Amino acid sequence: GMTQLELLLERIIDRVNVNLRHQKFDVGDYVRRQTPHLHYSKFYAFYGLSADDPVHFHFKNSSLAGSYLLGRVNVLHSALYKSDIRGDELKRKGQHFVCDGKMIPLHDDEVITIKDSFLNKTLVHSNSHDPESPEEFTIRNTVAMPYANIHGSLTEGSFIGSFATVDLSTIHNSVVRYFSYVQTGELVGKCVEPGQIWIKSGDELEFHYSFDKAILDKYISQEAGSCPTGVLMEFVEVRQEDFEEVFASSASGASVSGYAVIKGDTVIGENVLVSQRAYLDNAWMGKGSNAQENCYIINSRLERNCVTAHGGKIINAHLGDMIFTGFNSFLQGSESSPLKIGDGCVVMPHTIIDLEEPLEIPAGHLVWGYIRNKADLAAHSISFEEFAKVDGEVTMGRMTFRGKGGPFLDSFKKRIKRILSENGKNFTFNIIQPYQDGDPRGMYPTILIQPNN
């Protein structure tokens, strides 16, 4: 027969597949593996406990192997493998969901509910931005691959590829493939191929970029039945070890999680926030800067007020005042080819800078795509000053934009500003173990954790 876990996976596969059926996309070989009951029972999982935030966890008929969960989370008939479910931004009862001048009071504390889903090394963060569900950040009938980001995005009946990002969007019965970024409000019954960057707000704003596959695949790709490969993968994996070490484990206004890696000649300035799963190596953090979960900052200097979003990687770079580095960005200079970024620049999500020569980006530029040199930069950037005049359609190679450039640019300024603001929490991670043998091996029993009266 099949073990409970082997059966659990097949049922998830089947539920996801029926929902995705119109996309003729089979998740099976992305999920399915060798005697997982044996692989999974090897692992603990961890749940956060805080004196200051009332606990809620409900784990029912699931596996959690190697996962960390924080906040209020239900895991139902699911399998989470080395994922991070971060419910620290979830709203509380009596708080309001605000929408186009309406305010909807929450009946109950917001929870993250994961149901009939398989999440592999996936980060789930922020909260519900869909007024259909203000009390629940629902992920159901979903598969997500390594280093995916489900950021403030209700997801159902969908597939989220490796290093794919879904941002403040409702995802319904859709495929978002590796290294694709989606911020569209809603994505319904779609198939987004790999290496697409897509922003869409209303009917007067739309940005699209598309990576040359031949180039992208070197950094990240994945084939069904096999796990992801490429530079980005090597990069994160080769460092996961150092994260282990730090788990087992001076500047005014600064906060540095114990759950961050801090390495070499790192200098933490004032008002600097370094969150968990942040990785700093020889990092000079200028006043006001903010490293976020799952970002890497290496042999770099950030002058001031720089925000690095989740999955953001910065190597051998010098950043000025208030640079915003988007999701999953790979900004690699070297010692022979240093990278400079001028004040106020916005580096769009999923930007890959991999220098062959020294490069300096001038202040007040919007940057995207693939950049190795000066020519590439010219083909993959524009100044705020020029772009802010745009009212219509612009094409620059693999990039198209439709709408007003001013408000677009402003959407990014507001976002860094809000992060730097809000930015300016006492808890530990408790162990949870699975069945060690027999049929239920690798499964966790039905567990309900809550506060004492």
Give the nearer residue to Cl ion in terms of CB position, either 123 or 233. Answer: 123
Q: What is the dihedral of CA 411, 414, 419, 422, to 10 degrees?
A: -140
Is the separation of the CB atoms in 376 and 358 below 8 Å?
A: no
Asked if 97 touches Cl ion (CB under 5 A), the answer is: no
The DSSP 8-state label assigned to residue 419 in this structure reads H
Is the separation of the CB atoms in 251 and 233 below 8 Å?
A: no
Shortest Å, Cβ 4 to its own copies:
7
Name which position in 24, 34, 51, 101 contacts its own copies (CB under 8 A).
Answer: 51
Asked if 52 touches its own copies (CB under 8 A), the answer is: yes
Helix (H, G, I), strand (E, B) or coil at 15: helix
Q: DSSP letter string over 307-346? A: EE-TT-EEESEEEEET-EE-TT-EEE--SSS-EEE-TT-E
How many binding residues for Cl ion (CB under 5 A)?
8
Q: Which of residues 374-403 bind its own copies (CB under 8 A)?
A: none
Give the nearer residue to its own copies in terms of CB position, either 341 or 443. Answer: 443
Name which position in 13, 55, 182, 272 contacts its own copies (CB under 8 A).
Answer: 55
- Please state, in angstroms and rounded to a whole number, the distance separating the CA atoms of residues 166 and 183: 6
- Please state, in angstroms and rounded to a whole number, the distance separating the CA atoms of residues 279 and 263: 8
Residue number with the smallest Cβ distance to Cl ion: 161
**Candidates 28-36, 336-344, 376-384, 423-431 — which segment interacts with its own copies by CB under 8 A?**
423-431
- Please state, in angstroms and rounded to a whole number, the distance separating the CA atoms of residues 345 and 330: 15
Name which position in 66, 71, 87, 161 contacts Cl ion (CB under 5 A).
Answer: 161
Asked if 449 touches its own copies (CB under 8 A), the answer is: yes
Residues 298-311: b if buried by 16+ CB within 10 A, e if exposed: bbbbbbbbbbbbbb
Pull the structure tokens for residue 381.
């950037």
Q: Which of residues 326-355 bind its own copies (CB under 8 A)?
A: none
Is the separation of the CB atoms in 306 and 323 below 8 Å?
A: yes
Name which position in 6, 110, 130, 167 contacts Cl ion (CB under 5 A).
Answer: 130
Name which position in 177, 310, 318, 398 contacts Cl ion (CB under 5 A).
Answer: 177
Indicate left, alpha or beta for 386 from its phi (over 0: left) and psi (-120 to 50: alpha): alpha
Instruction: Say whether 310 counts as a known binding-site residue.
Output: yes
Name which position in 60, 82, 218, 415 contacts its own copies (CB under 8 A).
Answer: 60
Asked if 310 touches Cl ion (CB under 5 A), the answer is: no
Shortest Å, Cβ 443 to its own copies:
6
Strand 72-76, strand 96-99: pairing: unpaired
Shortest Å, Cβ 242 to Cl ion:
15
Asked if 195 touches Cl ion (CB under 5 A), the answer is: no
Give the nearer residue to its own copies in terms of CB position, either 46 or 330. Answer: 46
Give the nearer residue to its own copies in terms of CB position, either 15 or 151. Answer: 15
Helix (H, G, I), strand (E, B) or coil at 357: coil
**Candidates 11-19, 53-61, 116-124, 258-266 — which segment interacts with its own copies by CB under 8 A?**
53-61
Shortest Å, Cβ 53 to Cl ion:
22
Asked if 49 touches its own copies (CB under 8 A), the answer is: yes
Asked if 178 touches Cl ion (CB under 5 A), the answer is: yes
Give the nearer residue to its own copies in terms of CB position, either 4 or 299. Answer: 4
- Please state, in angstroms and rounded to a whole number, the distance separating the CA atoms of residues 327 and 286: 20
Asked if 136 touches Cl ion (CB under 5 A), the answer is: no
Which one-letter amino acid corresponds to residue 233? M
Residue 401: count other Cβ atoms within 10 Å of its Cβ: 22
Asked if 84 touches Cl ion (CB under 5 A), the answer is: yes
Site map for its own copies, 4-23, x if CB under 8 A? x-------------------
Instruction: Say whether 186 counts as a known binding-site residue.
Output: no
- 84's contact among Cl ion, its own copies, none, with CB below 5 to 8 A by partner kind, is Cl ion
- Strands in 111-115's sheet, in edge-to-edge order, are 56-60, 72-76, 111-115, 136-140, 155-156, 170-172, 186-188
Dmax over Cα atoms in the chain, in whole Å?
66
Q: For 85, what's the count of Cα atoms within 13 Å in the CB-facing half-sphere?
A: 32
Give the nearer residue to its own copies in terms of CB position, either 3 or 222. Answer: 3
Which one-letter amino acid corresponds to residue 422? E
Beta bridge partners of 159: 143, 175
Shortest Å, Cβ 332 to Cl ion:
21
How many binding residues for its own copies (CB under 8 A)?
30
Asked if 421 touches its own copies (CB under 8 A), the answer is: no
Contact residues: its own copies, CB under 8 A:
4, 49, 51-52, 55, 60-61, 426, 428, 430-433, 435-441, 443, 445-453
Output the known binding site for Mg(2+). Answer: 89, 125, 151, 310
Contact residues: Cl ion, CB under 5 A:
81, 84, 121, 123, 130, 161, 177-178
